[PDB]
Paper text:
The interaction between [name] [name] and host [name] is critical for viral replication. [name] plays a key role in the assembly and dynamics of host stress granules (SGs). Old World alphaviruses, including Semliki Forest virus (SFV) and [name], have also evolved ways to prevent SG formation by viral [name] binding to [name] (24, 39, 40).
[name]-43 interacts with the [name] domain to form a high-order oligomer within a double-layer ring scaffold. Totally, three continuous yet distinguishable conformations (referred to as Conformations I, II, and III) of the [name]-43–[name] complex were identified, accounting for 49.1%, 32.9%, and 18.0% of the total particles, respectively. These three conformations could interconvert to each other in solution. To investigate the cause of the slight conformational changes, we compared the NTF2Ls and [name]-43 peptides across three conformations. However, the flexible loops between α1 and motif 2 in the [name]-43 peptides exhibit conformational variability. This suggests that the [name]-43 peptide may drive the observed differences. Whether these conformational changes have any biological significance requires further investigation.
Residue numbers in the entry:
A (entry chain G), H (entry chain R): 1 to 138
B (entry chain K), G (entry chain W): 472 to 509
C (entry chain F), D (entry chain E), E (entry chain T), F (entry chain S), J (entry chain M), L (entry chain D): 5 to 138
I (entry chain X), K (entry chain J): 472 to 508
The structure:
């Protein structure tokens, strides 16, 4: 009955579950997860051969997220490992499979950094998101 | 109205009764977008 | 006049909730002549002596630096005592900073404030980790 | 005025010697309206109903039926408490009828007597093994 | 007609492979009005109530958050039961998200279908960990 | 129609009472078509196979020769099953001949007689000591 | 009237309900004589 | 609530408690603990120097119990060890202190054998009682 | 009738029942789902 | 007099099917004076010690506890040896517990049982992965 | 003022406290009860 | 300069009073580079190992755990060793845990601290029960 507060591991696992369920169902609402100074890169590839750079905000990450069509995405998580970091933040490492538009499942590797909003207790926003398919890099 | 220490009545539950929340979604407002499934 | 069992149970849950969530205000539980000991060892291995006074209790809490203390309360037994006070005997497991749980034995003594009804403060706090002294 | 540590240690020694030698004489340690919750398991198994008064205390002690009850005092803590009382938490091992030693805690609240100074009677006595809980 | 041992072993293999690979597809193992516990504990520290109906089983399965749920089958015992059912007792180890392997037991009651022969739907699925009770 | 939880609890109580009070008549719990295994090992190390038939069950019980078996039922969970049957999953400690307790996992499957109300027979009995297979 | 096997209702009780007694002292009669102190 | 007919150790401890409480209060009723074939010897010394022999029954054990005129007896058990024996009986081994008529405490050893009555379940009677003071032997 | 150990012809071939299905899964649909994924 | 290639192919298909299906009955392939050496389990897992007899072979196989071990055979070479024995060297991809496919070599030396014609038992069984060596 | 270790004058002498009593016992009667039987 | 006999008598009375009353702070009699050999058990009770320093000495004394020990001093011999040290050899009866009185010898070699005059610490402490030899 002792309420306590969520551990970093449980927080990270809950965030992974919430993030990928929302992405699979309503990708357009994904932009609500991030913040004003939230850096985001999601398996990009520019017209040069090197991985794409990262966005550093809200409007432009929403624009990127619309740029990727992100329809009927199926995700299969093989590894979520979370730990505590500076300012009660949680650093999360995720590995698994992702498939967009019902294509073949491709191996993805990702790193989240969640930070507290401060004013509201037990509220976290995605300060950092680093996602790469290990097929356009390996 | 039972209190312990010098804490005000209900202050304990006020501080400890914060559900785990993510992003800008309200608590319980992220699981509703994924109902009607199998 | 509520039952001492309920009084002790409610205090136990509140105390561990604040010991985990906001350890900064744990000192607000105690009073002027309250005693506190939370399982320390000196050079020679004797369990650390208790400290007295609200400010010294606050200092000792800060030195202990409880970070995200996960606790499982295996047993609580609260009973009446002098001046309608309550003695609470608790047994369980506690782990700070998310390492493995450690078995712990504890005794609280709560005294009424005598000014506000149904108000208690920790007159005595004795805490001992089992592996440390057994 | 004696130190709370002194009174606690002396009472611990006297109690855990008289428990071994003459367990039937333990009833005198306590007084009127004193709690003695030493017990094991019941229909629910976890909680043991307190017994109040020397009559019930002696009856419960005889029910426990200590024979050569060896005591292995690992640690004793004694602090002051209400009305110049002493709260002592003692942890250690117990062996009734020369059996396997089991880890135990006991909390006493040595309440003083107003008629004669330096006298003490056990207002609260709470006993709990470790194996029955964990 | 196949051996009850055959049906039990094949179902154990299929279930504990599909649990690792695609846990979201587990709901297709059960049928209408099928009991599925697997809770272990609830908010009140009690074995979770059974969830009935494929929708409820799928919801609870998704709530469990199986990621790379490795299974270490120590023993599988299958016996024939009423209405040409099969009762399977599976004991072993389980590790979710590459965590520490915990001892577990699981009871499967698989009922057949008068329509399609050699087809079984899991009528009962009871799961428990060893540590959560001992 | 009583609740399956109560049915399973009552059967567990009666079965573990007759395990030591009178193991001679343990076979009366089993029906003609009934599976029984109680945690045996063979020369090769595989767990002993189940026996079938009431008389074979009685013979196996006599070979096991339960002498004042002491039981501690840590957990029991019963649920509904085919033909209003009941599946019971029990976890606990069993000590044979006053020796050391041993952890065990068990599954009973009870099928109604169909002759008189609220009468059950042990269709299936799967018992397994933890140390033997883990 | 919940029964198991060929056991009559309450057959298990009647059989397993006897309390530990000594000599012929009915269970309890020794307690009174025993507690004959104050 | 498993009934679980009592173990030999608990049976023996309960018998010891009952024996040395009934003897402490009403030693007259002691005769009721035995049966027709109960042999009993209780630290006796005949007018020879050798330990006394044993009685083998009910009437003469009653006579003997009144013969040692037990009164205000104070007994303190230091050791009780019970084990199961033939015919569901329990063999009990006791050592401690016994004082009769408020004399000095005497070192005593004792061996009980309790046997089931047969008709009433969980009922035992003292088939054998062998009690000796150490000083009369050592 | 070339068998090995304490085996005769019939046992493991019957112990590998490819026709057995559970739930609504089509025969081998679960297997394929696990393989190459 | 069956062909060595034929018996090698028959054994390889039988052994791997049984290994994927019923890991418990893997010991049946062996007997007395049979050497089984595999990848090896230890504090570090590097020291892979050979075990002999059906008792140790089954114990080691259950310790390795293959679960849905999918095997894709790439090559099989069977040849004749002393006492009309058959030596089998096998290349394939082994994926245990739904891990990745890993190259391996399994070398069998099969001896005739003597009593029944066209009967063989695994006299020598040397398993060696690829990644752990290279 | 001869003392040993870190002990000052008479802390152990105060520790002794022969006059301490509990319950209804006369001073030291419990000691006398237990040491000599 | 204090008399050797006087200091021997004072130390023996003080040391045994501390041992009987408060065994916890028994280590305070010793310091650094002090040897303490006092019975003890390694695996059988025969291997007796000396320990050094207040750390080890207190740990050994607490492992021994004297409870209410009545030490009846029969004889005391004090003499002057080197560098104004004192050697004490004591005979008496020791009863630990209210057990039987047993004869013993305890040879002390005391050295002056150096800073404070008329101050000594136990440099060497050789205890031996008489009923371990003979």
């Amino acid at each position: 009955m002792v309420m306590e507060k969520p551990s970093p591991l449980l927080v990270g696992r809950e965030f992974v579950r919430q993030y990928y369920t929302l992405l699979n169902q309503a990708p357009d609402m994904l932009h609500r997860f991030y913040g004003k100074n939230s850096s985001y890169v999601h398996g990009g590839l520019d017209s040069n051969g090197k991985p794409a750079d990262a966005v550093y905000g809200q409007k432009e990450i929403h624009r990127k997220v619309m740029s990727q069509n992100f329809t009927n995405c199926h995700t299969k998580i093989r590894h979520v490992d979370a730990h505590a970091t500076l300012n009660d933040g949680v650093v999360v490492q995720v590995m698994g499979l992702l498939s967009n538009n019902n294509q073949a499942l491709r191996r993805f590797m990702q790193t989240f950094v969640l930070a507290p909003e401060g004013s509201v207790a037990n509220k976290f926003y995605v300060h950092n998101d680093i996602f790469r398919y290990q097929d356009e890099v390996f | 109205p039972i209190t312990f220490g010098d804490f005000n009545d209900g202050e304990i539950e006020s501080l400890s009764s914060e559900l785990l929340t993510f992003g800008d979604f309200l608590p319980g407002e992220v699981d509703d977008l994924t109902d009607s499934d199998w």
